[PDB]
Write a protein that binds this DNA or RNA. Structure first.
Ligand SMILES: [Mg+2]
Lengths: 205, 79, 85, 79
RNA sequence: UGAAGAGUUUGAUCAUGGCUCAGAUUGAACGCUGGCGGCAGGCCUAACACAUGCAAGUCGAACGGUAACAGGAAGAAGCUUGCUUCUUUGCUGACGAGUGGCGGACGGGUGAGUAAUGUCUGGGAAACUGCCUGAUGGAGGGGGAUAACUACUGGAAACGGUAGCUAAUACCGCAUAACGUCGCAAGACCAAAGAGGGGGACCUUCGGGCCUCUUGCCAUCGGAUGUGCCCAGAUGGGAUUAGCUAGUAGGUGGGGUAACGGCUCACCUAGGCGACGAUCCCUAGCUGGUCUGAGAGGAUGACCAGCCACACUGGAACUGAGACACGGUCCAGACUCCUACGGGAGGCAGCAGUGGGGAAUAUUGCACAAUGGGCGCAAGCCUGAUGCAGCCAUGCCGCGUGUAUGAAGAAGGCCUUCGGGUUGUAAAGUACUUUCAGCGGGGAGGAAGGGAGUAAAGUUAAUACCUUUGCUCAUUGACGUUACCCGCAGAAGAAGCACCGGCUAACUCCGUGCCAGCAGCCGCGGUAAUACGGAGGGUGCAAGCGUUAAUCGGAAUUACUGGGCGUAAAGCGCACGCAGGCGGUUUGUUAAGUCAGAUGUGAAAUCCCCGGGCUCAACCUGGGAACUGCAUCUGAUACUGGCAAG
């Protein structure tokens, strides 16, 4: 129940790079960004009105790996909760287990950390969790269990996202097995390109 | 012939009863004069797995309601 | 159909004959009191009424037919015989 | 004493029995309008002490006849 | 804390309107594809007919009992000279049948009937209440039999009739009499039972009184709880159904039910209901709530929960605290079954199954271990209600079918303007991890009770017994070769399905040429089809996806919040008017309309907000708010409304 076969050609559809393959030279076109969505590759994408809403719903679904049954539950939960419908929807995305394990250093990509969630490795607050939507509450430690502390790839991950921005709303020990979901990630410390207007106005009918 | 038996609103293999001051001949769990108290055999330090408001049983004993076995467990399984 | 009702159902036939036969014995001492009211008599209307007053409650407390239907016959029969003579 | 339901007399062609209508307002339940609605219920009275067209005070009582379970208390209006 | 639209009449356009589409949802079936697990679901059609198993039994602590079992006694004995072969013994545990007691009137299953006192809300009195409970008081003595059985006789079975014999808490008398019934009083009348446990004394035909405890049994008054009854409001369509009704409507009377009663029978009165929709035919079980809608409003009543109605089809009742009685009786038939032809048995709208009509809806499952029920002094019995397991993607919420790196941008496929391009970092090859399934081993809780012992201030013989409290051991699960944790392989078992002209996110080529075909509307095909058929590539969704059927939404397209009518469907040809709806102008006043305040009450469960628990979520859940409601007291007089005055 996720998108398997190719990965970067989907970024060639959605314009800018989605962090599916990162850290190496594939930032600058190891797949020719904007040149080949498909057979009819570098073409004329004469856009529409419904499209610029429909691209955004499959932008942030595909940045995290969430299908359509699950992403609507995050939407319908983002109405009953107090505040902005859009901003709570990004808050409910950032509190996701896989999204935290990625940008708390662990793993090369989110799909790897998802597999590192699903292979019994991660441990939240002293508790084993192998479900990729355990939605983390603030002041909780992340932790890798003992029998998979150093296997191959853990130590080479932190260095790549350390050239990336150190986010405000989390604390992290680069030494070992210690994190803190600090407080609510605001709109300012988002990736700032995602337009929350174009999802709230999509599902509303 | 009024009784103080327990209902059953649980899941599958996860029982969670209700302390039910009801009639004898009526349903398995479908009818009660009133309801006060509840129960759980899944406590294991969840919270209080029993909370009864014992005065209302002390009311309905004064009417004459004959009491049942697993509540008769609880009145000494509470102090 | 086949059950343990034959203990109960045949007993309901035992309590059909035995009971209803004693009902006419009650109704016999009903009739002659109403006959005496119809007769115009007053003294013998006191006789069978005072005769039937144990006969009422002997089959009203425990026996055939109960629960103050028999016990209100003591009201309306007494209310008529005082209005006659 | 219940509310001492005020009413009128519609017709008396019966033997110690009358017919009473009762003025009554209501919100109409979907449109929001006040329709003056009236009912019609038989009322026991012995003396024929109210005439056709009066204004009558009524309480309930034991159900005497068929179709009639209201005794008169007093009359506040002549014909 | 909430509200989106677009396509098609015409050569074009502004309006009017329909038809169709994007959404959300189902007890769903069918097509194709299909790996797991949790929760809930599964004859909606013939309420038509049912093979076969099962779905109501219990108390020996009511009774004679002794036919079966088991312990013994006694005697005969396997003599096996003390290990056990039998019979007497109802001697006892214990118990088949029959008397007797209570319960089978609940739990269940169905929605055929019922447009209504059936349901739903808020009020009322004219009565009962088996079992549980409060207090007071009572609780003497006799008698008649009889199945069962015995011996006999009828019938083919089913079954039938006799005499013998004994019991009771079976029943029939009889003594006794209120705070009880009748009665104004005075009066009169009515009831019953033992049973175990244990022994202190004495007595004893050694049966037992005797003493004590437990516990029934009787009468009355309460308290609950359940059920009968009444009142008013609210509850489907059709006025191409407008008149209906005599036991009808009312009153004295008798008679009648537990109770008021036209509930019945004679008599008098002549009524009763109806446009605020009676009778009528058609259709339908009703509510809490589910679905949808921002809301009002709209269709729904399967599941769990409330309440009635019905047991093959029509009837009538018996018992009973309670039934007009689902696994009881009688009267008929009807099918159906059986017969020596004379006769007897039958009722799946119980769970599981067959026939059959069917688009289609499952197993001739396991256990009394849970929580509830019945019977009991308990033990225990019994329970196709419940607790569980198989069946089926029917639905919901997870979850995996690998992640890095990687181009020479590979062979390959089609496109190709033969410059190339694309699939495509995709694959290959190097790295790396085993969730789940495979396979291996240990492994929570749902279990408290019960039974056994042993202690205590119990009350009595002060230590007997029993009742209560605390302690000790042994314990007691269908599910279940459980949930969960742990061990080892090896990328290893695990990806479909529709669309690609417009609405509507995604395009190019071969084949066919108004033929084959598509399609929800607009429409496409008559030699270059971005629409038919095929191939690469793309899109959306995912263990499912499409199609059909079905309800609301878009529909301001039945509009109260939210429409219109001079020409777009639509102002009766026109008049006075009855019942209906609606008030100039000032004061007084009442308090129904309405506002306010509380107090009742709106069953719990869903919806909603903070909070707990399953490794999260569905789901289970603590408390709140809300249930927009109706009825009552207190208050308010500005509007409105009845009375009074202008
Ligand atoms: Mg256990």
């Amino acid at each position: 129940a996720r998108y398997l076969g190719p990965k970067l050609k989907l970024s060639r559809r959605e314009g800018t790079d989605l962090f599916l393959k990162s850290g190496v030279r594939a930032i600058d076109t190891k797949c020719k960004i904007e040149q080949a969505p498909g057979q009819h590759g570098a073409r004329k994408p004469r856009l529409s009105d419904y499209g610029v809403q429909l691209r955004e719903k499959q932008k942030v679904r595909r940045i995290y790996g969430v299908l359509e049954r699950q992403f609507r539950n995050y939407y319908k939960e983002a109405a009953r909760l107090k505040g902005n419908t859009g901003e709570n929807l990004l808050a409910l995305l950032e509190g996701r287990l896989d999204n935290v394990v990625y940008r708390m250093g662990f793993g090369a990509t989110r799909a790897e950390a998802r597999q590192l969630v699903s292979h019994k490795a991660i441990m939240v607050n002293g508790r084993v969790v192998n479900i990729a939507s355990y939605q983390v509450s603030p002041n909780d430690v992340v932790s890798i269990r003992e029998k998979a502390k150093k296997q191959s790839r853990v130590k080479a991950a932190l260095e790549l996202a350390e050239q990336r921005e150190k986010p405000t709303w989390l604390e992290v020990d680069a030494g070992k097995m210690e994190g803190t979901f600090k407080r609510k990630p605001e709109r300012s410390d988002l990736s700032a390109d995602i337009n929350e207007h174009l999802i709230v106005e999509l599902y509303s009918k | 012939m009024v009784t103080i038996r327990l209902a059953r609103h649980g899941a599958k293999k996860r029982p969670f009863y209700q302390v039910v001051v009801a009639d004898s001949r009526n349903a398995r769990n479908g009818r009660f004069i009133e309801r006060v108290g509840f129960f759980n055999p899944i406590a294991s330090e969840k919270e209080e797995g029993t909370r009864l408001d014992l005065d209302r049983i002390a009311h309905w004993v004064g009417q004459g309601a004959t009491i049942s076995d697993r509540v008769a467990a609880l009145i000494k399984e509470v102090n | 159909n086949i059950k343990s009702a034959k203990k109960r159902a045949i007993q309901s036939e035992k309590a059909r004959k035995h009971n209803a036969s004693r009902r006419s014995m009650m109704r016999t001492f009903i009739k002659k009191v109403y006959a005496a009211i119809e007769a115009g008599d007053k003294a013998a209307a006191q006789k069978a009424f005072n005769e039937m007053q144990p006969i009422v409650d002997r089959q009203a407390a425990k026996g055939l037919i109960h629960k103050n239907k028999a016990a209100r016959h003591k009201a309306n029969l007494t209310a008529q015989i005082n209005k006659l003579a | 004493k219940i509310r001492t339901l005020q009413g009128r007399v519609v017709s008396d062609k019966m033997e110690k029995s009358i017919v009473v209508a009762i003025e009554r307002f209501v919100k109409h339940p979907i449109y929001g309008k006040f329709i003056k609605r009236t009912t019609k219920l038989h009322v026991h009275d012995e003396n024929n002490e109210c005439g056709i067209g009066d204004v009558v005070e009524i309480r309930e009582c034991r159900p005497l006849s068929k179709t009639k379970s209201w005794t008169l208390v007093r009359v506040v209006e002549k014909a």
